[PDB]
């Protein structure tokens, strides 16, 4: 029921930006 993701597309920025914003606000707080 679990599938290894394929190296399709190029890259996604939504998840990376959200994680970076969360880490930065955590550090500042």
Partner 1 sequence: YLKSVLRELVTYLLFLIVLCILTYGMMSSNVYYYTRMMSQLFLDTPVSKTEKTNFKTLSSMEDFWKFTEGSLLDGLYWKMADNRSFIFYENLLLGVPRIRQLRVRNGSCSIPQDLRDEIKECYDVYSVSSEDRAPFGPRNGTAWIYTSEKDLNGSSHWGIIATYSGAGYYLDLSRTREETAAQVASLKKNVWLDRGTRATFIDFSVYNANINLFCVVRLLVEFPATGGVIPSWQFQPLKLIRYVTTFDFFLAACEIIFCFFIFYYVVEEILEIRIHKLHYFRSFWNCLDVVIVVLSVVAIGINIYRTSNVEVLLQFLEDQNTFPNFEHLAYWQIQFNNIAAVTVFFVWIKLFKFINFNRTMSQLSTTMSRCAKDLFGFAIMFFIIFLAYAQLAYLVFGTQVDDFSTFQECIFTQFRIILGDINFAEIEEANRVLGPIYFTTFVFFMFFILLNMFLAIINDTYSEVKSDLAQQKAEM
**Site residues (vs partner 1, CB under 8 A):** 6-10
Q: Among residues 3 and 9, whose Cβ is nearest to partner 1?
A: 9
Output the smallest distance, CB 8 to partner 1, in A. Answer: 5
Of the pair 10, 12, the CB lying nearest partner 1 is at 10
Give the span between the Cα atoms of 29 and 26, in whole angstroms: 5
Q: How far is the CB of 17 from partner 1 (least distance, A)?
A: 13
1-29 burial by CB neighbour count: b if 16+ within 10 A, else e?
Answer: eeeeeeeeeeeeeeeeeeeeeeeeeeeee
């Amino acid at each position: 029921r679990f599938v290894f993701p394929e190296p399709t597309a190029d890259v996604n920025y939504i998840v990376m930006l959200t994680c970076a914003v969360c880490l930065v606000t955590y550090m500042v707080m």
